[PDB]
Amino acid sequence: KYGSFSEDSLYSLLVAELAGQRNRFDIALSNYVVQAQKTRDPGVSERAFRIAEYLGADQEALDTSLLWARSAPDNLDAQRAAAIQLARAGRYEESMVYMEKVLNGQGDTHFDFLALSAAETDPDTRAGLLQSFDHLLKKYPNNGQLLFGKALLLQQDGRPDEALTLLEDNSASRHEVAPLLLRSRLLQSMKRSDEALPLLKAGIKEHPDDKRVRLAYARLLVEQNRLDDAKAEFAGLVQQFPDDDDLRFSLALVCLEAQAWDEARIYLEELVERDSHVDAAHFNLGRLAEEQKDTARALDEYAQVGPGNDFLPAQLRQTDVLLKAGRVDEAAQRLDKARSEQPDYAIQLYLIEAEALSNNDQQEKAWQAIQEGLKQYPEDLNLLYTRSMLAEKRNDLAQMEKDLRFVIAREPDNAMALNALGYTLADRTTRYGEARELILKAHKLNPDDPAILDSMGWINYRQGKLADAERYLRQALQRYPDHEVAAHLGEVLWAQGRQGDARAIWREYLDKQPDSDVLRRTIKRLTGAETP
Amino acid sequence: SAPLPLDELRTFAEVLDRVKAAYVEPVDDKTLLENAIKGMLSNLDPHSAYLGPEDFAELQESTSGEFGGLGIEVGSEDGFIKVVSPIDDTPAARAGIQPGDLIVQIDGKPTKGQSMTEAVDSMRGKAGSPITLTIVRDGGRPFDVELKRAIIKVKSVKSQVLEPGYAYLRITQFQVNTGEEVVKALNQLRKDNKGRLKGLVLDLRNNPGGVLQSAVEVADAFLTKGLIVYTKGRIANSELRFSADPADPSDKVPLVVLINGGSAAAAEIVAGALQDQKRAILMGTDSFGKGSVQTVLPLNNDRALKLTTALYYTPNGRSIQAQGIVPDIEVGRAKVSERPQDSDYQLSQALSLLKGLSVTRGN
Amino acid sequence: SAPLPLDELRTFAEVLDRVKAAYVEPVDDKTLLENAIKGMLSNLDPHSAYLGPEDFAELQESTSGEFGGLGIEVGSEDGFIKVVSPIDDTPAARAGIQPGDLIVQIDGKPTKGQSMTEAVDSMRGKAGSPITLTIVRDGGRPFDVELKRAIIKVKSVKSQVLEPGYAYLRITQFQVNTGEEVVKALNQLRKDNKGRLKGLVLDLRNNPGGVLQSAVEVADAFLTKGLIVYTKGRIANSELRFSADPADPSDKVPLVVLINGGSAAAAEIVAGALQDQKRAILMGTDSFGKGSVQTVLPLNNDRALKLTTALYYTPNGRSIQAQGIVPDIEVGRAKVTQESERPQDSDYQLSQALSLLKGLSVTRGN
Amino acid sequence: SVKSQVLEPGYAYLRITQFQVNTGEEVVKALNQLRKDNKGRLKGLVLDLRNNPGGVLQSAVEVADAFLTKGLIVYTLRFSADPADPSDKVPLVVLINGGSAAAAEIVAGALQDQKRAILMGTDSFGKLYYTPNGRSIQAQGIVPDIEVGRAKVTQERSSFEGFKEADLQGHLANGNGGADRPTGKRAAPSERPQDSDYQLSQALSLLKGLSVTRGN
C-alpha cells in the first residue's frame, strides 16, 4: 500500500538527506521545500517542516507547514503547527481557520499542547495568538476547553488574574481536570496557597482518579509546612500507585520533613529495593543517618549503587555523615575507591573530600586531600580554588594567591576568582591599586553579586575612599547579609567617623551570626571590645 | 495519493554515511554507490548485471576469438554457479561432468560471492591451457577436476539414420544458420528413405540454448499452424510473438522429443511448442526451466544495464521460466556395429514407442 | 566543504527508475533500497554484510551461547531424526532421552518429509512453550515425551584427560561466556589431576571464530604479562589494545596448540598471542588467515549491519590478515602404520601432540 | 660411513652406519661443511646411530669427542672428552632402533649420560664398557628416556583444502605489506626422509619443540 518514487523526486530528496549529514542544511531546505511543493506527499512535507524549523528560517518554514497541513490535514498536529506558524507570520485569520481545523475535531481536543508550544514563543507572537484566541472564544465561548486554552496563554503572558477570574466564572472548569489544574497553577503563581489547598482537595474529592491533583495538593501542603497532611496523602498515593517510585520517594522526603526517621528510611529502602531513584534515596538515607542513630547501613546503601550524577550529592552526604560519625579514614577510603572507579568523578570526589574536611575544621587533612586531587589533575580550576580557600583557612596566603592567579589565567571570565584575588591582594598588600583593578574586573564581570560588592567595598576602604565603600557594602548586605560584610562595613564607618552606626550594625550582625569570629575580631580591634 | 516511502530512503542515506565513517580503508563515495548499484541489480535477478562503461565497450566487439572456454554454461542459483548443460563435443562434457552439478571453486577461488558473469569470464582463457574446477554433485564432497581450455567447434546438428525406418536427429546448440542445416538434413533423410519416414526422434537434450530465431525456425520446420512462442514483459516493446509457416519439410512424420533436464531456453522453447501444438510428444525428464530474456539498456551515461526484460511463454498459457517445460512421459536415463539406441535407455524407449505407434497410424 | 557527489546520485536515481520500469515483476522501492544496502555492504569486502532480522537473531544466538531449545544434538537417519546425544542439564536430559533415540514426531507431526533445518526450527521456539516429542528408541514402541522449550547455554569448551599428566581441551566456537568456561575447565582439569599437570593440548581445529573479547579473555587465561592483541583502524575507537593480566590458572604448564585450515579470527588471535609470546607451540596446517574485527552497528529497523571495523596485529606487530599463521611443527594429517576410549590412537595430529608433550616432560628431567 | 643432509632449515641430519677408522675426522668434516650449509648455527641435529653394529674404539671415542667437551668419554682405559669440538652445543638427539651396539652404543651412552644429548629410539641391542656415568652398558643395555617404536607413516591427500583468505576476491592486504600467499597447486616436490619413517619425524618435531620453548 506504499507509494512510488519518481526519477527526480528520489533524486533531490537523496541529496537533501545526504546534505543533512554534511551540515550543508541549506541544500536540504531547498530540495525538501521544492519536493514538498510539487510531490504534496505527507512524509516529505513533514520532513521539510522539521528541517525548516530546526534551521530557523521561518518564511519557507511557514510555507512548508502550510503544505504539510494541506497534504494530510487529518493529522491534527500538523494543523496545530501550521496554525502556530501562521500566528508567527501574523495571518491572524487563517490561523483561526487552522484553529477550527485542530479544534472542533472532537478527538483528543487538546490545548495543553498549544500552551506548551507557545511557551517558547516570543511575547509579541504570543499576544497575536491570544488575540486570535479571543476572537475564537467570541466565536466559540460554549466549551470550557477554549477558556482553558485562553487562560493558559494568559498565564504564559504573565497576567494570571484575568485567567483565574475566567476559570472561576465557569463551573465546567471545576468539572474538567485541566482547567482546575490550571487554576491551581494560577493560585500558586498568585502567591495564595491558602486558596490553592482548599480548591486542591475539592478537586481531589471531585476527581479522585487524577493523581496529579492530589500530588500538587501535597506539594502545596509541604510548601505551607503542613508536613503531616502531605505525608498522609503521599502514603495514600503509594497505596493507590505502589508501582510509582517517584510517589514513594516524595513520601520519603515528606516523612523526613516530618522527623519520622523510621518510616522515611523504610521508604528509602523501598526505593533501593525497587532500584529506582536510588541515588536521591541514598542522599536522603545519609541525611537521615546524620539525624538518626546508625550510619553503617547508610554507607551500605551508598556503596551498593553504581556511578550516578545524582549520586555525587549522595556521595557528599555520605562523606558528611561519615565525618559526623567520626570515622574520617573510612570516608577517605571510600572516596579513594570511588576515585578509582572513575577519574572524571574522581576530580569531584577530591573536591568534595577537601570541602567536607574543611567544614569539619580538619584544615590539614583537607589540604592534603586537595593537594592529592591536584597532583592527579592539577589542570582543574575548582581544585585550585578549593586549595586556595584551604590555604586562607591555613594562612598559606601565597598558595591562595598562586591558585587564584592560575585559575584566572585559565578562566579570566570567572568573576569569583577575580574577586577572591582582589580581596587577597587588598588584605595582604601595601599597594591596593592592582587589587582595585582585579576587583573592578570582577565588578564589570559580576556587578550585582553580594561578594563582588563586599570586595569592592573592602578595597575601597583599603584605598581610603569612604562613600563608595559605604554604598557598595550596603548593596552587598542587602543582596545577602553576612558577618564578614558587616565587619567590612564597620571598618568603612570607622574610616567615616560615625562610630555609633558601626557599633549598631556590628551588634545587629553579631546577633545574626554570634558564632562568627571575624566580626568579633573587627569589633575588638576597632571599638576595643569583643562586642560593641 | 499514497504514502511515499521516504523512511526507506532516509535509512539508506544514514547507512551510506555510517559506512563511509566506520570502514577501515578510506573509501570514496564513488565506490560505495557503484557497489550499491551492482548489488541492487545482482540480488534482484541473478542473471541481470550492471554492464559498466568499459564493460559496455568490451561488449560492443569481441576482444579476440583466440580464447575458447570449457564449453559449459551456468545459471546463478542460491548464490552458487551451477552448470546448466555441458555442451556436447567438449572436454568438460567428455570429462566427468553431469548437467545439474554445482561449481564451488573456479581457478582456485570460491564462487559463492560473485555473479555468474564473473564466473563465465574466469572460465574462458587462452587456448590449449589447463584449468581446474571443484564441483559438488548431488551433495557429494568436492573433488578437483582438471580440464583443458581450447577453442571449440560445435558443428550444430547431426542427423543419423538410426534404423531404416527411423532417423535420429540431434541438435547440439542453437547457433545461427541451424535451421537451414536441419532442413537439409531432413531432405537427406527423406532421400535415404525414398521420400517417406515412419517417424523421428529429436534428442534435443544436453543443449544449453542459443539464438531464439533458430529455435523458431526449426519449430516452424516441424510445424505449420499456431503461434510458436510469445513473450511478455512490462515495457511496451516487450510483447514479441512468433507464428508457424505452411512450409514444412517434416512431411507430417510423427515426432518424439527427449528432454533430459540438461536443456535450457531455446531447446525448452522448441519442446514446449512441439507439445503444445500436439505436433509431437515428450519422453525425457523435466527441463531446467530458464526462459528469461536479457536485453542491454542504455542509461543517461554511456553505461547500460542488463535487466531481464521479458520471460518466455509457450503457445499455451504455460510459462517456461516459472516451472520449466515438463514431459508427458518420464524415463530416467540409464544404460542397458552397435547402434546408439542400444546404449542410452531413453533413446531405446523412444524408438520402441515409434515402432509401436507406426502400426497405429497404419501408413 | 566536501562537495555532495551529485553525478553518482543522479546515475543511481536513473538506474532505480529504469529498474522499476523494466523488470518483469512489479517491485517496491523498499525492496530495491534494501537490495542496494545489502549490495554495497556485501561488495565492500568479503565479510561485511547487511543483517536481516532472522539473520541478526541467528548471529546473536551464535555469538551468545544462550538460546531457546530442547538441548538435544541430533542427526539425520533414514528419514528419522536420530538423537546423537542429549546435552546434560537440559529438558531432554531430565526427560530421559538417551543416545541413539530416534525422533519421529514433533507434537505428532512426522519427521519424515521434513528437512533437518525444518526439524531444528520446529523443535525450537519461545522459552516456556510446552512441546511433546514421540521418540522411537532403537526401533521400540514410539512414546510421547512432554517437554517445555527452555533457555539453554550450549557448552563451547570440551575437556578430557587422555593420559595421567596430559590432558585435552577444545574450543569449538568462541562465545561471550567462552572465556569464563575455559577458566573453570582449567581448574577442573587441575582438580582432576590433584594439582599437578604436566602437559596440555588445546584444540582449535575447525573453529570459525567468535566475539573478540572472549578470545582475548581466553588468551589472557594462560598468558601472564605483555599485550595479547591490539587493533588498528580508521575510526578512533578501533585503536584498542588489550593486556595479559598477571593472574593465570595455567600454572605455566607447557602448552601445545593445534591450528587447522578451519581455524579462524578468534582462534588465530589466540594462536598468535601464544606464539609471539613464547608460551606454547603451534603444530598443524595453516590457518584461515583472516584478520578483521567487525562491529554489529545497530539500526533503527532492528536489522543491524556488520562491518569490518579494523584489522589487528599479533604482539610482534605482524598483521596476520591475508597471510595466515605458520605453525612451527608443520604437521599435516596422516596415518600411522606399525612394523579404553583414547582419541590419541584414533587421531593423528593429537597423537603427535601428546608425544611432543611427553617428550618435553621427559626432557624437563626429574 | 657418514652422510649429511639438511632435513629442514636449521635442522641438519647425520648418520654413522659403521664406526670405521678415521670416521672421527670425516664426521668433523661433515660438521664443518653442514655448518657452512646452514650459516654457522643449527637449531638441532639428529644423529642416526641406528642399525650400527660396531667399530673401532678410537673411532667411537673421537666421534663422541666431536660433540662433547668435558668429562670422560668411555672407560672399562679411560678415554677423555677433549674440550675441542666444532658442535658448539647444538641440541643433539640420538636415535637407537635397537640394532645399535658397541661403538654406536658407547657413543650414545656418552652423549646421554653426560646429558649432552637425548636418546629417542628404542632399547639398544645391549652390546666390557662403562658410560661416563658409573652405570654399565653390556650387562643390561641402554633404555632411551623416550621410546618411539619403529613405525611407518603415510599421509593422505584430501580432494580439497580450505580456501584460504588469499583466495577470496577483494581480500584486504596485510598491514605489513608482505605478499599474500595464494593456494596454488599443492603437490609434494619430493619425499624428504622426515616423512618416511616415524622416528625421523618424531625427532625433528621434538627438536623444534626444544627450540621454540626453553628459549627465553
Numbering used by the authors:
A (entry chain C): 44 to 575
B (entry chain B): 38 to 373, 410 to 436
C (entry chain A): 38 to 376, 410 to 436
D (entry chain E): 193 to 268, 277 to 327, 348 to 436
Quoted from the paper:
During bacterial cell growth, hydrolases cleave peptide cross-links between strands of the peptidoglycan sacculus to allow new strand insertion. CtpA assembles as an inactive hexamer composed of a trimer-of-dimers, but its lipoprotein binding partner LbcA activates CtpA by an unknown mechanism. LbcA has an N-terminal adaptor domain that binds to CtpA, and a C-terminal superhelical tetratricopeptide repeat domain.
Therefore, we performed a heterogeneous refinement leading to two CtpA–LbcA EM maps. As expected, the two CtpA hexamers in the two 3D maps are superimposable but the two LbcA supercoils are wide apart, with one supercoil in a higher position remote to the front CtpA and the other in a lower position proximal to the front CtpA. In the proximal binding mode, the LbcA hinge region (H7–H8) rotates clockwise by 26°, compared to the hinge region in the remote mode, to lower the TPR domain by 22 Å and orient it towards, but apparently not contact, the substrate binding pocket of the front active CtpA. TPRs often serve as a scaffold to mediate protein–protein interaction. Therefore, we suggest that the observed TPR domain movement might be linked to substrate protein binding and delivery to the CtpA proteolytic site.
